[PDB]
Design a binder for this molecule. Structure first.
Ligand SMILES: *C(=N)[C@H](C[C@@H]1CCNC1=O)NC(=O)[C@@H]1[C@@H]2[C@H](CN1C(=O)[C@@H](NC(=O)C(F)(F)F)C(C)(C)C)C2(C)C
Ligand SMILES: *C(=N)[C@H](C[C@@H]1CCNC1=O)NC(=O)[C@@H]1[C@@H]2[C@H](CN1C(=O)[C@@H](NC(=O)C(F)(F)F)C(C)(C)C)C2(C)C
Lengths: 306, 306
């Protein structure tokens, strides 16, 4: 029993982290097979970053200009290219700790674990959601660029995020592992801001199913509602719309706990309207929207990884 | 910027996890050097567990009765002993992934990461505090016994917790790595309950310093107070007493943020009395007591591990 914001075990990703230095600038890289991936602004001075021309900056660089350190081993760089906002460095040594892996681009509301690194070394791991405005509520500092976000499926690491920048209000933005930003941001130090954020409704419901699984049931009322009556109320409270795909996805939890997805929607409808009245669900005094249905199932049924 | 409940990177501990089967009963073991440690109730049937005589149960067992599986390798058991509530199994192969490590017993209020495992495989990692009543608010299921809690210091894993049981209200109890329970519990299925829990005051203050570091400052008032005026109020609200050792420990954060420890106590005094008035500190609608001062410093200054 019990419900925590759980991270994926990080060991597979730890074996892939390296430090990448170009001149004065140092950040983290991901070493997979014989390629190191990192954010392209490693090739910028602090001044370049206000208004960089990356293609121009990269012409001036040759392979020996990139210092890649894996522990106390320097990896010899034998090629380099740029793919959108990530730099790819080919090295003459294949990382022997490379796990089976894929590159994926995730959807808003999906979760992943971030392995926060500095100088190629891990500082910690935590669970994050891609927010509907395409930010993540991270804990990331100077030097953390190149830290990656990931899921594990059995023995396979799906890398979905590489960290690039912090935005106003202390939220974070980055790219998929092809260098393509989540959201309309660019890797340049100029005034930018996230769109107004919104609550991931399918995740709140999944969290409510987890509460039921763990014996938190005071918020259950005796009502149903159609998808229309609920989504109408949700729009006003700035809640993302709930689709029938979401209902289908919530299915396994609905069948497990004996509560139809629409009955949970009825219960949540009341909660939003009437407030929690000083009580807590799973020890939180706020509706929680950063657990996907599969996160709840993986947590509550003990799913492991190899 | 940003503040998350962060776990230690788990890779070092992952390399130590194995599965230990005795007859029908299976749970997790920790393989360090040529010894596997696990909870001693692996030698119990379900019926034995209501009222076990462990010494009696263990006489009946020889080395070949313990199936230890490390991945797809069976480790040959060549010795076994019992040390309080943990069983130690000597195997003929030293774990080549054994990190530098120590066994420590932690104090109430101290934090650690739990690597939750089933069948010798990791399911996830999360941060936990030893509660003042000697429980932990875990997320742990059937088969999770043998999962361990730990800290990392540079390159050294300090193992502080081995998981044994769940108590009423869905909280968890276990031993240090010498088999000695935290708190007055015993490894037997009979009615037991945790003492009434209490809020770890030095941790709340450390969390308030983290909020200040990250720009959350609305709860700061213009008052001081002596340690007596505050601790008197705290007793009523069921807050652990704040000692001068705690003040000395809070020192680095006090000097970093420019707020004397007593001024933070003044601010917290008001918070408890007047409530948060529907606002959130670091995005939480509740005072948070599961970050030690060193957790805040390690998170906010980017401390890594090798
Ligand atoms: C990579 N190591 C850092 C990580 C930052 C640093 C502080 N917290 C983080 O997450 N990435 C950067 O510093 C990027 C980078 C230039 C500047 N930058 C920023 O994150 C800046 N943000 C912005 O300029 C804004 F508003 F656009 F988001 C900063 C003010 C330093 C937070 C480049 C190349 C975008
Ligand atoms: C080890 N794999 C399990 C982990 C438990 C199972 C469900 N959640 C957990 O954390 N450990 C046990 O099942 C231990 C073990 C016998 C029974 N037990 C319990 O945790 C039981 N608790 C108690 O009996 C009580 F009240 F004393 F805490 C149970 C009712 C199954 C939760 C032994 C040998 C103590």
């Amino acid at each position: 029993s019990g419900f925590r914001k759980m991270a994926f075990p990080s060991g597979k990703v730890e074996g892939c982290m390296v430090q990448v230095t170009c001149g004065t600038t140092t950040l983290n890289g991901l070493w997979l097979d014989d390629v190191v991936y990192c954010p392209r602004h490693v090739i910028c001075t602090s001044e370049d970053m206000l208004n960089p021309n990356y293609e121009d900056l990269l012409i001036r660089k040759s392979n020996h200009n990139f210092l890649v350190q894996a522990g106390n081993v320097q990896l010899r760089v034998i090629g380099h290219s740029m793919q959108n906002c990530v730099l790819k460095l080919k090295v003459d040594t294949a990382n022997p700790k490379t796990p089976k892996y894929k590159f994926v681009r995730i959807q808003p509301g999906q979760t992943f674990s971030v392995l926060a690194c500095y100088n190629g070394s891990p500082s910690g791991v935590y669970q994050c959601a891609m927010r509907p405005n395409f930010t993540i509520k991270g804990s990331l500092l100077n030097g953390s660029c190149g830290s990656v976000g990931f899921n594990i499926d059995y023995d396979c690491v799906s890398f979905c995020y590489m960290h690039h920048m912090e935005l106003p209000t202390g939220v974070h933005a980055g790219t998929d592992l092809e260098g393509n930003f989540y959201g309309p941001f660019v890797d340049r130090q100029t005034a930018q801001a996230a769109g107004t954020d919104t609550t991931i409704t399918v995740n709140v419901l999944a969290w409510l199913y987890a509460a039921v699984i763990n014996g938190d049931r005071w918020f259950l009322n005796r009502f149903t509602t159609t998808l229309n009556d609920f989504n109408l109320v949700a729009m006003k409270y700035n809640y993302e719309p709930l689709t029938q795909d979401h209902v289908d996805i919530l299915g396994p939890l609905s069948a497990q706990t004996g509560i139809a997805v629409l009955d949970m929607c009825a219960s949540l409808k009341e909660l939003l309207q009437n407030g929690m009245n000083g009580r807590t669900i799973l020890g939180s005094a706020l509706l929680e929207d950063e657990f996907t249905p599969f996160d709840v199932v993986r947590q509550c049924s003990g799913v492991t990884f190899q």
